[PDB]
Amino acid sequence: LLVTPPKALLKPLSIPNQLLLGPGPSNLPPRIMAAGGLQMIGSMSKDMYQIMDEIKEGIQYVFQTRNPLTLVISGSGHCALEAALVNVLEPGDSFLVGANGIWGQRAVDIGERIGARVHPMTKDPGGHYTLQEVEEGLAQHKPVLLFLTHGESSTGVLQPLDGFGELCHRYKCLLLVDSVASLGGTPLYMDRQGIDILYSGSQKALNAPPGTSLISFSDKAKKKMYSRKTKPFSFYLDIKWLANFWGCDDQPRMYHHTIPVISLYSLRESLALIAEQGLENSWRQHREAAAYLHGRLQALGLQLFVKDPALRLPTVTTVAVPAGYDWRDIVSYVIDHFDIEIMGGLGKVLRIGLLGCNATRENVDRVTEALRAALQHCP
């Protein structure tokens, strides 16, 4: 045989103890770890369906919707995003994109690839979107879909949502919102803010492991996706298939692909936890924690990138890179000395993440103490 058994693979697997306080993913609580270590069931069993059904109710609770087209995408953030775009947008269609960070910049790339006419409202890092600025683009381009990034995790910006859906609906437009870095860590009401496509990820404020995502579609969205001329470019992400399997339509569930059963156990639990906490409690915790963290960082003499506190994303705090330092040096120091992960921002600045169980005063202390030492030790 050409290749021999890899020597490295013949040693036992060993992983460190890291406190993950970057934009994502987050650490796992015991219940989610426990779920991950369970045994398989049939991927098309009555029991597996029950679990999926339970998950659906959970996606409904956290999204605050009753949309019966709500389900899990067998993929990460980008897959839920891609899934949205490839099932809603037909080649030609006009797509209006809020390019504040990256997330917009990705939604763009996807749009371009599937042959959409892409309308990029570029705003420098830190910037958000004013309803008027939307209507001016909506007037200028007459799109079929707008994409807005709720929790902009590259810039630490919390986009205001209220009233945007009803603007979009007037111009016939569909609202797609990226709530991956916002869900569970700030107010969000899918049906009451009139959102047509909402998606989130498992590995941010729900404290499940990466590789699943939550998606929900309004009837307005459902119509546009169920009255395409053409078939979507992706079969894996074809909604008409997914919807059927996940039990959304009248037809009995027909095998499409194999769902990541063990991740679904985990996700189910992560949903049960925030269902036991309660959304408003979760939003309180994140709101307060964030508040504490800004105060502490302020004390160290660091400047918060997002100036207006009402525009700061609780879950992800952007901190301006202190003049005269190498960001790599600080971030590497932190992990190296204290065993704490703090990302940078992509497209610069320092990024810190309070997500679910990880969003406690203790963790803020810890990252503050760490950034302290580093500030006085980095060249």
- Give the interface with ligand PLP as residue ranges (CB under 6 A): 23-24, 76-78, 103, 151, 153, 178, 180-181, 201, 203-204, 210, 257-258
Could you tell me whether strands 316-320 and 349-353 are parallel, antiparallel, or unpaired per DSSP bridges? antiparallel
35 lies in the site for its own copies, by CB under 8 A: yes
Residue 17 binds which entry of ligand PLP, its own copies, none, with Cβ cut-offs from 5 to 8 Å by kind?
its own copies
Q: What is d(CA 84, CA 177) in angstroms, rounded to the nearest whole number?
A: 10
Q: Is 304 helix (H, G, I), strand (E, B) or coil?
A: strand
- Facing residues of 251 across strands? none
Residue 261 binds which entry of ligand PLP, its own copies, none, with Cβ cut-offs from 5 to 8 Å by kind?
its own copies
Among 87, 179, 182, 203, binds its own copies (CB under 8 A): 203
Q: What is d(CA 206, CA 264) in angstroms, rounded to the nearest whole number?
A: 13
131 lies in the site for its own copies, by CB under 8 A: no
User: CA dist 51 to 206, 208, 241, 247, 339, Å?
Assistant: 17, 15, 19, 12, 36
Residue 153 binds which entry of ligand PLP, its own copies, none, with Cβ cut-offs from 5 to 8 Å by kind?
ligand PLP
60 and 66 in contact (C-beta within 8 Å)? yes
Q: What is d(CA 216, CA 65) in angstroms, rounded to the nearest whole number?
A: 8
Which of 205, 374 has the CB closer to ligand PLP?
A: 205
Which of 180, 237 has the CB closer to ligand PLP?
A: 180
- Check the annotation: does 372 bind a ligand: no
Structure tokens at 314: 């609780």
Residue in this structure with the two tokens 């963290």, named with its chain if needed: 293
Q: What is d(CA 115, CA 211) in angstroms, rounded to the nearest whole number?
A: 27
Which of 193, 368 has the CB closer to its own copies?
A: 193
97 lies in the site for its own copies, by CB under 8 A: no
Which of 70, 179 has the CB closer to ligand PLP?
A: 179
Residue 260 binds which entry of its own copies, ligand PLP, none, with Cβ cut-offs from 5 to 8 Å by kind?
its own copies
- Which segment (6-14, 136-144, 215-223, 315-323) binds its own copies by CB under 8 A? 6-14
Structure tokens at 332: 């590497």
Minimum Å gap between C-beta 279 and its own copies is 7
- Which segment (108-116, 120-128, 139-147, 159-167) binds its own copies by CB under 8 A? 108-116
* Phi, psi torsion values for 276, nearest 5 degrees: -75, -45
The contacts of residue 155 (CB under 8 Å, 6+ apart) are 100, 101, 125, 126, 127, 305, 306, 318, 345
Residue 178 binds which entry of its own copies, ligand PLP, none, with Cβ cut-offs from 5 to 8 Å by kind?
ligand PLP
Radius of gyration in angstroms for the set of CA atoms belonging to the chain, rounded to a whole number: 21
377 and 305 in contact (C-beta within 8 Å)? no
Residue 181 binds which entry of its own copies, ligand PLP, none, with Cβ cut-offs from 5 to 8 Å by kind?
ligand PLP
22 lies in the site for its own copies, by CB under 8 A: yes
Structure tokens at 344: 């940078």
279 lies in the site for its own copies, by CB under 8 A: yes
Which of 63, 134 has the CB closer to its own copies?
A: 63
Site string for its own copies, 230-259 (x = CB under 8 A): -xxxxxx------------------xxxxx
- Facing residues of 285 across strands? none
Among 49, 68, 78, 220, binds its own copies (CB under 8 A): 78
* Phi, psi torsion values for 310, nearest 5 degrees: -65, -10
Minimum Å gap between C-beta 109 and ligand PLP is 13
User: CA dist 344 to 8, 102, 281, 329, Å?
Assistant: 31, 13, 29, 11
268 lies in the site for its own copies, by CB under 8 A: yes
Q: Which residues are annotated as a binding site?
A: 351
Q: Which residues are annotated as a binding site for substrate?
A: 351
